[PDB]
Amino acid sequence: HKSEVAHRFKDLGEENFKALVLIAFAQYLQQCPFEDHVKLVNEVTEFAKTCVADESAENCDKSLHTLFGDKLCTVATLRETYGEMADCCAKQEPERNECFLQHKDDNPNLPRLVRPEVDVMCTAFHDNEETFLKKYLYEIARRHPYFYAPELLFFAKRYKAAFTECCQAADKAACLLPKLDELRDEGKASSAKQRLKCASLQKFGERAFKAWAVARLSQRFPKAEFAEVSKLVTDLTKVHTECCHGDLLECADDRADLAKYICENQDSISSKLKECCEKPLLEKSHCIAEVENDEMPADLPSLAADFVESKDVCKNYAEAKDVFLGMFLYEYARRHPDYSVVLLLRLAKTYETTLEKCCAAADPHECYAKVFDEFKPLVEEPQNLIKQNCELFEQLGEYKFQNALLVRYTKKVPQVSTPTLVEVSRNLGKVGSKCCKHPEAKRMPCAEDYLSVVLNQLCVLHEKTPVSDRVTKCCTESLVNRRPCFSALEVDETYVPKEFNAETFTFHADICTLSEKERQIKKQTALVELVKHKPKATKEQLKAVMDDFAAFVEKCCKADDKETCFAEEGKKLVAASQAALG
Ligand SMILES: CCCCCCCCCCCCCC(=O)O
Numbered sequence: 001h002k003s004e005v006a007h008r009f010k011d012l013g014e015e016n017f018k019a020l021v022l023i024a025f026a027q028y029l030q031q032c033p034f035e036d037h038v039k040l041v042n043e044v045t046e047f048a049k050t051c052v053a054d055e056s057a058e059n060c061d062k063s064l065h066t067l068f069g070d071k072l073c074t075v076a077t078l079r080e081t082y083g084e085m086a087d088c089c090a091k092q093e094p095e096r097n098e099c100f101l102q103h104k105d106d107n108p109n110l111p112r113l114v115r116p117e118v119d120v121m122c123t124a125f126h127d128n129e130e131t132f133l134k135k136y137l138y139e140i141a142r143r144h145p146y147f148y149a150p151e152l153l154f155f156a157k158r159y160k161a162a163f164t165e166c167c168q169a170a171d172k173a174a175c176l177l178p179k180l181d182e183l184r185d186e187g188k189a190s191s192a193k194q195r196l197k198c199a200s201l202q203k204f205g206e207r208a209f210k211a212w213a214v215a216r217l218s219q220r221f222p223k224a225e226f227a228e229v230s231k232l233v234t235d236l237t238k239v240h241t242e243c244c245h246g247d248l249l250e251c252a253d254d255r256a257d258l259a260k261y262i263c264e265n266q267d268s269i270s271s272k273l274k275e276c277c278e279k280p281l282l283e284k285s286h287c288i289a290e291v292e293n294d295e296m297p298a299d300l301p302s303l304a305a306d307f308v309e310s311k312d313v314c315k316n317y318a319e320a321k322d323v324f325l326g327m328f329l330y331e332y333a334r335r336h337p338d339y340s341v342v343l344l345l346r347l348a349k350t351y352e353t354t355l356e357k358c359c360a361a362a363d364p365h366e367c368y369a370k371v372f373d374e375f376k377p378l379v380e381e382p383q384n385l386i387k388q389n390c391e392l393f394e395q396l397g398e399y400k401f402q403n404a405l406l407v408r409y410t411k412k413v414p415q416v417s418t419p420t421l422v423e424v425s426r427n428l429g430k431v432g433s434k435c436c437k438h439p440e441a442k443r444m445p446c447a448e449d450y451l452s453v454v455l456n457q458l459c460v461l462h463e464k465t466p467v468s469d470r471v472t473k474c475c476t477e478s479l480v481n482r483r484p485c486f487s488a489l490e491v492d493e494t495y496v497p498k499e500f501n502a503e504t505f506t507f508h509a510d511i512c513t514l515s516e517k518e519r520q521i522k523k524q525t526a527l528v529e530l531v532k533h534k535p536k537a538t539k540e541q542l543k544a545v546m547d548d549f550a551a552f553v554e555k556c557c558k559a560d561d562k563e564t565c566f567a568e569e570g571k572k573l574v575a576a577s578q579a580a581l582g
């Protein structure tokens with residue numbers, strides 16, 4: 001209407017409004033105390049209500065941008081705390097807003113946010129639920145000022161439900177700790193996934209992005225016509241482009257518009273949207289993004305007629321190459337919800353390479369007659385990797401699977417740090433356990449998505465402290481080529497072994513009184529260092545050692561003296577091992 005603020009307040013509801021205002025202020029004023037933000041929230045909410053009562057009331061017809069920037073510029077310590085950010089206030093909109101946006105600090109220097117003990121958390125949750133949760137929301141938003149505010153709200157509500165259920169359980173910790181871990185990991189991945197999509201857009205351009213959206217939306221909405229998918233791809237590309245620039249309101253409005261269009265057109269798109277489309281504005285976009293794949297229509301024909309048989313392939317291609325490739329991609333993807341999106345794009349690139357060569361060659365239709373054959377080994381490559389790795393997972397369990405991976409990747413890239421090798425290997429093993437309990441139909445997209453996050457963490461860490469030319473290569477490739485680049489890593493025959501360090505392999509009784517988790521990580525750290533010291537060590541030779549180390553740890557955590565069993569048996573274990581592996 002006349003009043004954007006009034007209109008937001010009506011659409012979100014007072015509770016969501018207050019939480020979004022808190023996140024937004026926290027994201028821009030990363031260094032003000034919680035109590036300051038509480039007071040800004042209350043003033044803004046007060047003013048909002050006046051508008052709701054009367055859109056003609058004073059100031060109620062200013063833009064949300066103008067109101068927000070005005071409010072920021074009234075912060076008394078703005079120059080003293082934020083330095084050059086206060087210079088934004090000398091500008092008029094929209095420059096002022098742009099200026100504010102650029103001064104968000106993606107790397108604030110704040111202490112890590114520690115998880116308190118369970119009884120401490122549950123007690124504060126009971127004694128003042130609202131401030132417990134809102135102060136958490138503030139601590140998180142100010143540490144991640146680009147994280148999309150409504151998704152951050154969706155996480156906050158899941159935490160609230162976590163505390164609600166677990167703080168009244170018999171074993172509070174056993175209930176609560178798994179949920180907090182799950183949520184922390186989902187959140188960190190979700191944020192790493194937003195960042196990664198924006199970086200890929202930048203580096204690879206808008207056409208690769210559109211290719212990716214085609215494949216993905218085509219899998220999702222297999223009954224939509226190409227021109228409907230193409231339309232969503234164009235809109236989605238705009239949404240993601242604007243959301244990467246970072247203005248909350250511009251991103252939210254784009255996301256709302258698309259959700260609305262989709263909901264007004266369910267019968268052209270998918271039959272699984274009814275639920276999402278009935279949800280309030282706040283949750284619509286999010287629910288649609290997560291909607292399960294529609295059913296494939298059923299009597300769909302071979303792509304042969306259109307894409308290989310037809311006289312006109314080269315004509316139809318030449319007339320609009322991306323549209324033709326896009327149609328190829330659409331028809332492929334909609335028939336294959338069981339493929340990774342990156343597999344579909346390799347196949348599209350193969351087809352494109354083939355048309356480019358064949359359509360300019362002596363006999364086009366002869367030249368590309370056999371193109372679909374090129375696809376077979378690109379499909380089977382990941383399928384067979386999934387079966388080889390998942391069989392290994394079933395034989396070993398998760399922990400021993402992680403150990404095999406640790407041995408595996410240490411030999412390939414022994415220049416990687418141990419903590420990186422250990423974190424990534426543990427994490428890849430978690431992808432094992434997650435995705436290998438899916439049936440075939442769902443295995444490839446599972447791995448793609450979870451691998452995408454682990455192999456991005458790997459790349460993130462590594463480009464921060466570079467050490468392997470091979471890893472930097474795989475990290476700087478197209479996202480299409482990232483994972484196969486990693487699967488092609490070969491043992492580093494060039495590697496000079498690490499020199500023996502007695503400390504590295506000295507163990508104390510404190511390890512008997514460590515978490516299951518933390519003991520594992522110390523055993524896995526030693527395993528890596530064992531491989532880094534004896535890289536040519538054999539599978540039988542490694543297992544001999546592990547079996548002895550295992551015996552050792554039971555023995556020395558089972559005695560009346562602990563301290564010296566660990567020093568005494570230790571010296572013995574290490575001696576035995578150093579001559580077993582020659
Ligand atoms: C109608 C939307 C445009 C779709 C363009 C199709 C391009 C398909 C083949 C090339 C694959 C690009 C993958 C990449 O380089 O990241």
Ligand SMILES: CCCCCCCCCCCCCC(=O)O
Binds near residue numbers: 024044067071247
């Ligand atoms: C005395 C109260 C003055 C009212 C403050 C303005 C309320 C609107 C807040 C808009 C927050 C959105 C931030 C953004 O995306 O840039």
Ligand SMILES: CCCCCCCCCCCCCC(=O)O
Binds near residue numbers: 220239
């Ligand atoms: C699977 C596509 C269905 C379309 C649903 C529209 C929502 C996508 C918006 C994406 C960009 C927003 C920023 C983010 O939260 O990552």
Ligand SMILES: CCCCCCCCCCCCCC(=O)O
Binds near residue numbers: 523549573574
């Ligand atoms: C280089 C010779 C010193 C060898 C010392 C033994 C190192 C043992 C670490 C093995 C990790 C145990 C695997 C496990 O059971 O979790």
